[PDB]
Design an enzyme around this catalytic site. Sequence first.
Site, PDB file in Angstrom:
ATOM      1  CB  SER A  27      -0.943  -0.012   1.214  1.00  7.18           C
ATOM      2  OG  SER A  27      -1.876   1.065   1.177  1.00  7.18           O
TER       3      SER A  27
ATOM      4  CG  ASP B 247      -5.343  -1.921  -5.261  1.00  7.78           C
ATOM      5  OD1 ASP B 247      -5.934  -0.935  -4.779  1.00  7.78           O
ATOM      6  OD2 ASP B 247      -4.263  -2.331  -4.791  1.00  7.78           O
TER       7      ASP B 247
ATOM      8  CG  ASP C 217       7.949  -5.440 -20.110  1.00  7.51           C
ATOM      9  OD1 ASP C 217       8.550  -5.374 -19.014  1.00  7.51           O
ATOM     10  OD2 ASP C 217       7.994  -6.445 -20.845  1.00  7.51           O
TER      11      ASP C 217
ATOM     12  CG  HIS D 178      -5.199  -1.363  -1.365  1.00  4.22           C
ATOM     13  ND1 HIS D 178      -4.161  -1.149  -2.243  1.00  4.22           N
ATOM     14  CD2 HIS D 178      -4.847  -0.746  -0.209  1.00  4.22           C
ATOM     15  CE1 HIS D 178      -3.218  -0.431  -1.649  1.00  4.22           C
ATOM     16  NE2 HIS D 178      -3.612  -0.176  -0.413  1.00  4.22           N
TER      17      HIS D 178
END
Lengths: 269, 271
Positions: A143, A196, A234, A258
């Site tokens: 986080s 998230d 990427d 999350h």
Amino acid sequence: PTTQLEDFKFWVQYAAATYCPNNYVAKDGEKLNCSVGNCPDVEAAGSTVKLSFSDDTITDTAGFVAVDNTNKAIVVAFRGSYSIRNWVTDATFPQTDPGLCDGCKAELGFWTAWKVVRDRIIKTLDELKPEHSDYKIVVVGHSLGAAIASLAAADLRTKNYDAILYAYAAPRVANKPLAEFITNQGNNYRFTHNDDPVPKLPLLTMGYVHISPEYYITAPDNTTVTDNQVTVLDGYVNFKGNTGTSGGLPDLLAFHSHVWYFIHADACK
Amino acid sequence: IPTTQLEDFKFWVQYAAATYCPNNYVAKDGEKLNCSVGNCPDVEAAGSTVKLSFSDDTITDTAGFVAVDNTNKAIVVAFRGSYSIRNWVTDATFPQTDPGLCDGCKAELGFWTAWKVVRDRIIKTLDELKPEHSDYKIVVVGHSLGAAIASLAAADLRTKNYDAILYAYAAPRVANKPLAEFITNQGNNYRFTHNDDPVPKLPLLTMGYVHISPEYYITAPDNTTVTDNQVTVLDGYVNFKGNTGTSGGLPDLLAFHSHVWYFIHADACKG
């Protein structure tokens, strides 16, 4: 047999440990432990705190430097502020010059949080070298703590500490030049999970991008992550993966995503 | 003195603001409402006094007070809900329960539970205040999750003959369609939204919730004086032309700034 996935599942347990109040006030020599049971392999390794830090005053940052004699690692682990609403309520994310590379800029809040603890951490790393000399240096967070870890790793590397970065559920910390700089350092493992919202902040329009690559986890919440549920993507901006979820918006109701990065990362409170 | 509806709306939100101040929700009987950060000046000017305060740090994370305003002749029941938005949404589940208010009516379990924990104390207090305050308005008010609790409290109190006037600033949805229609047709409902505030978009329509009508949709910028041209009244149980239609219909986390500015800085007294 050791696989990249098994490695990913391990270091997140140190991020989890940073949420435990006992660990970020721990005395030098105290064993890390997570009362809710989400760092069992850390406890199995017998890892101890060298230095703990808790910021009540400014950044609401906590964490520790720990020594893992089983896996021969020095772990620098960060917890950021728990209040997501406090983080976003001003709706502004000014940048600052970290002094790392030409034109490089970092998120002011996260860079400040790192600066407050940087000197203790460097002193501690130096003290540990002689009897730990061949140990790897792991810099880890989840986080907001993963954002602090990203910048900490970047800075430590310019100081010749060979830091391996595990940044679970990290916000963006860097403008384009700094993201390129960090990316080129290598040994970066940055994770996102489904939709998230937190890795979508601060915004692309605020002059931030991501460290590359993205390790995009598509496993459901509260399930073990398998090998076909992690996709490597990427680029400093990639809309396959987390950045393209929810139409590009940070959905508040996606917050459940999350807290599940291989494990229930913040469960220790 | 002549006053407008807008001025009224700018006043009761200060009681919502007062529920964030720890001194007000632990206050004993007789303590004056006051806000250390200075965002309830007209409450203080009115001399409003706490009769009962309540705080639940155990199960529901609910706090608030019943206060007497002798200037405006109102008994005010004000609620603060949980401050942690992340804890509220992290399960991503919002089960419904039967509040016993009307046929087929269902309410959000968490908010209904919060009201139930303090209901008996609050009714006891309203009953004690009635004889010497007999013609006073009964105002039920909150901001954010507290506004959700206020919504269900007002609904329930009205079925018990208390003629509750509801000011629900920045409220989440609390009701399924039959309950929202029931509450709406009780009247005396003032529910506010502000621009793209994400909180009034939760729980989802797809979870079986709708809103009490009408919506007072505030379109003023943060930290500015709101004018009549910046408040739009939109009726219907689902209305896409106000807050519900913002951010493509999604609850934008970065729109959270909108949640704390409802005429005043509503939660500033949380320190």
